[PDB]
Ligand binder design. Sequence first.
Ligand SMILES: [Cl-]
Ligand SMILES: [Cl-]
Lengths: 305, 9
Amino acid sequence: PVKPNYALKFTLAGHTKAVSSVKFSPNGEWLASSSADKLIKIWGAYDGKFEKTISGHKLGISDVAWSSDSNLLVSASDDKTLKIWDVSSGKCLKTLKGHSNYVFCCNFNPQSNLIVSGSFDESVRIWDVKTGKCLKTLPAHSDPVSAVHFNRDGSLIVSSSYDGLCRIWDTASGQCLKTLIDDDNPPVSFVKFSPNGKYILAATLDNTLKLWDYSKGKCLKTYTGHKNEKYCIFANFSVTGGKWIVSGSEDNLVYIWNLQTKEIVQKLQGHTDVVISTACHPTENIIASAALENDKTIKLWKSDC
Amino acid sequence: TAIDVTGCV
Ligand SMILES: [Cl-]
Ligand SMILES: [Cl-]
């Protein structure tokens, strides 16, 4: 497969301000969206049908993340809390307090007994899901933390920051195992482990995606041609069909690259503002994209490969 | 340089 054929299938409208994040449930059934409107919305992954609104944050939400069982969500808010939600009931199970500035990014570990959060307070916190207690506060960065992600066995956390660094943390000890940077120092706006945990994909605010073999400390691939100088745009590995890199862009497009050759293979037109977030469905060739204040929508795109 | 992002060989 040299090129996918993503076509727009559904538009998920209803948020009243900028959409900040979209995530598929690990079981493929649902999509969760967060917005500056203080709301989480749940949608059918396959039909785009609205399921429910989850309210309770006092200010805008920057991020949401699912547990591995597709039952819990965690949200990160400008109100300086995370909330853990039971998605099937809508209930707030716990509020995680401790950050001193906006909570910007969050994730469960694969086991989903821990949550990791990054904040404009420049820290990374590790939380016990069962008790809601903060287990560790890491002095991770020297500017806002743009992303946090566990690797596939939960033993490592990767963080990114406007300070210019990607850092790898021992989950158990909280010790910094590695700092990655390539001699340039633009803000790092995004980071995530590959599905196997061997690679890290990072975005920098000089219009670059960077793929690290982090154990060798080597940047092996870059993906360029998109616009990203201002906003924290979420990128992905697409591995259900052809092997692609997917990202949003400040020219309102979704960009798709060949994982190996780093060539652009598709640009998806339809958003009327910056595409801040993309997600790739766990089993089907389906991309979710979400855009900022002048758009307010999520889109579902489907490909034969 | 072909990479594998999902398997652990
Ligand atoms: Cl609907
Ligand atoms: Cl970004």
